[PDB]
Design an enzyme around this catalytic site. Structure first.
Site, mmCIF file in Angstrom:
data_model
loop_
_atom_site.group_PDB
_atom_site.id
_atom_site.type_symbol
_atom_site.label_atom_id
_atom_site.label_comp_id
_atom_site.label_asym_id
_atom_site.label_seq_id
_atom_site.Cartn_x
_atom_site.Cartn_y
_atom_site.Cartn_z
ATOM 1 N N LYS A 134 38.358 48.985 45.860
ATOM 2 C CA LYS A 134 38.573 50.116 45.300
ATOM 3 C C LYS A 134 37.436 50.475 44.564
ATOM 4 C CG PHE A 155 27.268 36.987 41.954
ATOM 5 C CD1 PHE A 155 27.001 35.767 42.185
ATOM 6 C CD2 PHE A 155 27.310 37.104 40.404
ATOM 7 C CE1 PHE A 155 26.653 34.799 41.680
ATOM 8 C CE2 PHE A 155 27.070 36.007 39.630
ATOM 9 C CZ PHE A 155 26.871 34.923 40.349
ATOM 10 C CG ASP A 168 35.283 33.254 42.006
ATOM 11 O OD1 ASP A 168 34.535 32.280 41.724
ATOM 12 O OD2 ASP A 168 35.909 33.926 41.209
ATOM 13 C CG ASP A 220 39.514 30.168 44.910
ATOM 14 O OD1 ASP A 220 39.046 29.574 43.991
ATOM 15 O OD2 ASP A 220 39.950 31.447 44.902
ATOM 16 N NE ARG A 231 38.131 38.187 47.483
ATOM 17 C CZ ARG A 231 38.778 37.726 46.241
ATOM 18 N NH1 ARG A 231 39.214 38.819 45.843
ATOM 19 N NH2 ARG A 231 38.438 36.778 45.768
ATOM 20 C CG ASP A 259 41.010 30.041 36.392
ATOM 21 O OD1 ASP A 259 42.154 29.393 36.033
ATOM 22 O OD2 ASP A 259 40.959 30.558 37.594
ATOM 23 C CE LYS A 295 38.254 33.995 37.728
ATOM 24 N NZ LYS A 295 38.968 32.822 38.644
ATOM 25 C CG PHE A 309 43.842 44.813 35.096
ATOM 26 C CD1 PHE A 309 44.368 45.936 35.858
ATOM 27 C CD2 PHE A 309 43.210 43.570 35.638
ATOM 28 C CE1 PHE A 309 43.699 46.079 37.350
ATOM 29 C CE2 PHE A 309 42.849 43.929 37.185
ATOM 30 C CZ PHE A 309 43.104 44.953 37.674
ATOM 31 C CG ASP A 337 46.494 40.646 39.316
ATOM 32 O OD1 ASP A 337 46.221 41.538 40.539
ATOM 33 O OD2 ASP A 337 46.494 39.608 39.529
ATOM 34 C CG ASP A 338 48.750 36.716 35.985
ATOM 35 O OD1 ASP A 338 47.892 36.674 37.067
ATOM 36 O OD2 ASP A 338 48.556 35.896 34.975
HETATM 37 MG MG LIG Z 1 46.556 37.881 41.167
#
Ligand SMILES: [Mg+2]
Ligand SMILES: [Mg+2]
Lengths: 339, 339
Positions: free
Chosen positions: A47, A88, A93, A97, A102, A164, A190, A229, A233-234
């Site tokens: 975005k 980057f 990441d 993970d 993505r 994290d 983070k 934010f 998001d969570d």
């Molecule tokens: Mg999330």
């Protein structure tokens, strides 16, 4: 909004400039082609909110008589630097993970014939940031300010990522480390520093506003926005409408330190702790389903709704107290977007 | 030599300083502990030749009346920055090549409970460089010079690594890309810039010698030294005495763009090309054995011996032409070590 389309037309130039400078250097050509492919694949498709925040904040900050073609070109470019920083982190990441996709498409490292070479590709994305700053901002008085801001942003992000990773290892349930104090800390380092402070701070420096106090003031506002934010998001990861949001969440499968799990744990009668202990972070559906229902039974969606109202009040009080002498709109534009 | 032991006592301080600065920041403590463990494991255990080149070059360059306790502390520190740069590349390169060991011990990423998190650990090692420079050199007039030198060194190294990865993918024999032009280019970008130019260049800047011409002059000498070091590294990989060297080479198993394979290919009658095509880069011994014997049959060990004599003459001519006004010893110390 429309300012966006412009930001994106500039990418072509960004790329041209970063993928040519060998004209007495023939033999490295092929690595430069590969760098072209890393940029096109990894910097495009999001975005662009962070890069754009740079451009928008720059227009609002600079007393209008200092916005010529070149000044604006430096703002698009620094906006693109924020986007390269993002790129980057994400490429890396996603390897860590083991993610599959993505921005709707196959993660770069999952592409055939890339794999772990993506580690060098990510490092290139990072290095491209400083190459751009040198190309466009080397003679500006804020040049060193920006180099240090990007370096610091990276370090904050990385150390947040370390925290994290120590806190939420995928494949290992331990909810004794999911605390409010620890959730807040992960988000600040983070996410919020680079997502919210970095882009405005960069605009400030380009505008000549380099004061410690002014930057601390803006930072206070922006880290608090960043916390919200991410908390949103969570919440939306699980309770969002996938058509409005744009994907289904796997926070609970991934044993994420989600704001939800944290809240849940603040409210669990010893049995419920177990109900969560035997269900958080599993492949199968019935296990995730049961966690969502435990959340619903603790009225987490309403605790969220209450949290967001309070948080909104608090952000406005912060803008009122800490925005001056910056135009409050700098912050209000971002508030409008995240709320 | 003895100067070494000193460099290494300084590490303790390096670490102390990088792993404390949260005293109003409690909650990130655990990530800082993990950073301590990454530094102790990854920056220690090598020969330290690069970091030390910084210290030695600094003493020889600075008109002796400007070497107080603090100036020297900045040199040890910048030497340690070069070592952190090295550490960062190695942790990452070891993941990308799937290596098993490094400096005799288990690669960091192979450690239980590290795995791909080592990608974030490597990024931290890189970030530690700039944190040190800010801590110790922020008020110096060469501060920006050094930041840009480290950033450029990284980019050169990374892009060299990209070129190596495009040229020599482990598991895929193609000798059409193993050319002299391509071998030389890999070495310059991947190895020689950071191994040879970076440490001396950094010493120069700390000494006030920031001229473009002087730096280009030193660079000309030092990249040519770097080419030799690596060519000698490749030859010794196969023909070294493992007691004197300290491990057996796997360059040929790994389908490396070795100076040897390159030379071999310059001298292969069409059958031999095939003999190499059907044997380069295989697990099994008989295949490697046969390549070594093909090399011996082309008198590569003597082509090397001749190359090293010529290269030595050439380096001395370069020092003679390009060292002034720097003390020739700056370069001769390094020549003595690599030859
Ligand atoms: Mg999330
Ligand atoms: Mg070797």
């Amino acid at each position: 909004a429309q300012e966006k389309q412009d930001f994106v037309q500039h990418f072509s130039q960004i790329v041209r400039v970063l993928t040519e400078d060998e004209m007495g250097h023939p033999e490295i050509g092929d690595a430069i082609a590969r760098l072209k492919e890393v940029l096109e694949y990894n910097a495009i498709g999001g975005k662009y909110n962070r890069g754009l925040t740079v451009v928008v904040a720059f227009r609002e900050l600079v007393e209008p008589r200092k916005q010529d073609a070149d000044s604006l070109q430096r703002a698009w470019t620094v906006g693109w630097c924020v986007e390269l920083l993002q790129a980057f982190f994400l490429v890396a990441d996603d390897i860590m993970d083991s993610s599959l996709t993505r921005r709707g498409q196959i993660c770069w490292y999952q592409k055939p014939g890339v794999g772990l070479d993506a580690i060098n590709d990510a490092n290139l994305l990072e290095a491209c940031i400083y190459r751009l700053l040198k190309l466009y901002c080397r003679e500006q008085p804020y040049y060193l300010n920006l180099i240090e801001l990007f370096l610091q942003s990276s370090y904050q992000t990385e150390i947040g990522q370390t925290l994290d990773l120590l806190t939420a290892p995928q494949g290992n349930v331990d909810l004794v480390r999911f605390t409010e104090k620890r959730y807040k800390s992960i988000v600040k380092y983070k996410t919020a520093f680079y997502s919210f402070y970095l882009p405005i701070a960069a605009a400030m420096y380009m505008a000549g506003i380099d004061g410690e106090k002014e930057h601390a003031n803006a930072k206070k506002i922006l880290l608090e926005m960043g916390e919200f934010f991410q908390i949103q998001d969570d919440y939306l990861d699980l309770f969002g409408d996938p058509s409005v949001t744009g994907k289904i969440g796997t926070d609970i499968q991934d044993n994420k330190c989600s704001w939800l799990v944290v809240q849940c744990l603040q409210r669990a009668t010893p049995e419920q702790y177990q109900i969560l202990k035997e269900n958080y972070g599993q492949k199968e559906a019935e296990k995730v389903a049961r966690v969502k229902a435990l959340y619903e039974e603790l009225d987490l969606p309403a605790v969220f709704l209450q949290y967001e109202e309070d948080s909104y009040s608090h952000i406005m009080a912060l803008i009122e107290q800490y925005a001056a002498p910056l135009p409050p709109a700098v912050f209000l534009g971002l508030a409008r977007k995240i709320y």
